[PDB]
Write a protein that binds this ligand. Structure first.
Ligand SMILES: N[C@@H](CCC(=O)N[C@@H](CS)C(=O)NCC(=O)O)C(=O)O
Length: 214
C-alpha cells in the first residue's frame, strides 16, 4: 500500500459524497489510529481511502465541507460523515466485509463494554502521571493486567482478537515508551499478561502498518 500525502491548509478539497469511502485521519492521532487499524485488520485497504490532514496546518474545507466538529477521525461512507473513534471501529466492523472483530458471546460482549467504558479512565490515569498530578498509571495498568486474566481462550482482552484490543493499542503504544522515558517505569514489570498482550499485538501486521508513514 502507498500511504498518501498529508493535506494542508493549501490543499484542494477531495470529492465529498462521490461514493468513495474516505477515512479522515492524522498520521499521529491515536484515536484515528484505532480506525485505521480496524480498516487494515479487515482487509479494507482498497475499500477505504485514507485522507491524512495536518492538524497544525489544516484545510478549512475539512470543517466546512466534511466534518463540522473539526476533529479526526471521521468516516465518509454512504452519504454520511460520522465521527467518534469507538463508534467508528464498531461501525466499520459491522458494515464492511472482512473477518469479524467482535464476538457473539454475550458474556464477552458485556465485558467488552466494561473495557470500552474504561478507556477514558485509562487515558486520564496515564495523562495524570505524565503531568505529575498523581501517579495513577500503575493502577491503570493493574486494571488492564487483571482484565487480561478474565478469558483464557486467547491472549487478548476477549480471548481472541477484537475491537477491544484495537481500541487500546494506540494508547498503550504511546504510554509504554513515555512511561519508560519520563518516569523510568516499565509497565511490563510484574504484569505478564500485559507483556504477552504487547508481544501478540506486535505480531499483527495490520496493526504494525499503522505505525508506518509516508
Ligand atoms: N472523542 C474523539 C477524540 C478525537 C480527537 O481528540 N482527535 C484529536 C487529535 S488526538 C483532534 O482531531 N484534535 C484536533 C482539534 O481538536 O482541533 C474520538 O474518540 O474520536
Amino acid at each position: 500500500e502507498v500511504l498518501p500525502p498529508v493535506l494542508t491548509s493549501n490543499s484542494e478539497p477531495p470529492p465529498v459524497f462521490d461514493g468513495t469511502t474516505r477515512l479522515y485521519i492524522s498520521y499521529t492521532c491515536p484515536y484515528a489510529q484505532r480506525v485505521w487499524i480496524t480498516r487494515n485488520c479487515k482487509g479494507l485497504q482498497d475499500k477505504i481511502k485514507l485522507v491524512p490532514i495536518d492538524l497544525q496546518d489544516r484545510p478549512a474545507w475539512y470543517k466546512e465541507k466534511v466534518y463540522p466538529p473539526n476533529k479526526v477521525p471521521s468516516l465518509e461512507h454512504n452519504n454520511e460523515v460520522k465521527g467518534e473513534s469507538l463508534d467508528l471501529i464498531k461501525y466499520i466492523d459491522s458494515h464492511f466485509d472482512g473477518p469479524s472483530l467482535f464476538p457473539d458471546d454475550p458474556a464477552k460482549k458485556e465485558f467488552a463494554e466494561d473495557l470500552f467504558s474504561y478507556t477514558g479512565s485509562f487515558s486520564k490515569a496515564n495523562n495524570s502521571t505524565f503531568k505529575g498530578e498523581a501517579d495513577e498509571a500503575g493502577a491503570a495498568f493493574d486494571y488492564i493486567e487483571t482484565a487480561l486474566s478474565k478469558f483464557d481462550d486467547g491472549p487478548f482482552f476477549l480471548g481472541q482478537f477484537s475491537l477491544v484490543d484495537i481500541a487500546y493499542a494506540p494508547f498503550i503504544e504511546r504510554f509504554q515508551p513515555a512511561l519508560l522515558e519520563f518516569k523510568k517505569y516499565d509497565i511490563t514489570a510484574g504484569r505478564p499478561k500485559l507483556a504477552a498482550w504487547i508481544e501478540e499485538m506486535n505480531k499483527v501486521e495490520a496493526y504494525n502498518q499503522t505505525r508506518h508513514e509516508p
